Design a protein around this ligand. Structure first.
Ligand code: YWQ
Length: 124
């Protein structure tokens, strides 16, 4: 059974220098990571850092999660990321995405023991 930490790696982890793909990165990535199987996931960020660097964020700046839980953490460093946002014309199961590359501070929710990223909350 897929753990929350494993699901965070599948949905958000793309360790590389930055986005690389043969075509539209977000279309290819959201499909291959199975983020378009039951619905078009409307917004999804990929993080192009090492897993260790992303896991380390669970000990960085504690911030309120958007839902009001208090187990969110903001990276001290900017981080190479790629935002995927569903287009207006995208309708499931023909999901389409616009790709936005950025360097931003990420905000993740962490849980468990070991305390590890389980949710991507925002970037700033
Ligand atoms: O900059 C951003 C903003 C958001 N995300 C997403 O990332 C996931 C985190 O991972 P998870 O394990 O958490 O996965 P899930 O992907 O199942 O989402 P959650 O259960 O956490 O709930 P939620 O945040 O309410 O999103 P939904 O996708 O259910 O739909 P809505 O946008 O509300 O549409 P609506 O207007 O009602 O039709 C989602 O929560 C969501 O935050 C990014 O990547 N980057």
């Amino acid at each position: 059974k897929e753990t929350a930490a494993a699901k965070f790696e599948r949905q958000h982890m793309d360790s590389s220098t930055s986005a690389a793909s043969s075509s539209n990165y977000c279309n290819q990535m959201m499909k291959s990571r199975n983020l378009t199987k039951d619905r078009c996931k409307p917004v999804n960020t990929f993080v192009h850092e090492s897993l260790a660097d992303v896991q380390a964020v669970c000990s960085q700046k504690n911030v309120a999660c958007k839902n009001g839980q208090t187990n969110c953490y903001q990276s001290y460093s900017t981080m190479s990321i790629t935002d995927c946002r569903e287009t207006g014309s995208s309708k499931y199961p023909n999901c389409a995405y616009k790709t936005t590359q950025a360097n931003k501070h990420i905000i993740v929710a962490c849980e468990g023991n070991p305390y590890v990223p389980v949710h991507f909350d925002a970037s700033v």
